[PDB]
């Protein structure tokens, strides 16, 4: 059978998001969006995923782009310009 090797390969590589003073380590494939990002966070920290600004290499990250079309690797430094309150 013509197995599909375009999901294949991958893995979880390691996101230090800062939630302002908190560094939060986290681990997800490089077939999710940094908007897939928001939706997976959105539930977990509770706030609005328009306000959670991905920033990365001092650039903002758009909702198509993937963790690999974002420049993000494993031990990637994400700035995350929302609100703790």
């Known amino acids: 059978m013509g197995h599909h090797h ?3 390969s991958h893995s979880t590589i390691k996101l230090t998001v800062k939630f302002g003073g908190k560094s939060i380590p986290l681990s ?7 908007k897939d990002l928001k939706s997976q966070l959105q539930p977990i920290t509770n706030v609005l995923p328009r306000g959670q600004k991905l920033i990365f290499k001092g650039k903002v990250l758009v909702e198509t782009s993937t963790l690999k079309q974002s420049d993000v690797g494993s031990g990637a430094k994400l700035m995350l310009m929302a609100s703790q309150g």
């Open 6 to 8: 375009h999901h294949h």
């Open 28 to 34: 997800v494939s490089p077939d999710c969006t940094v």
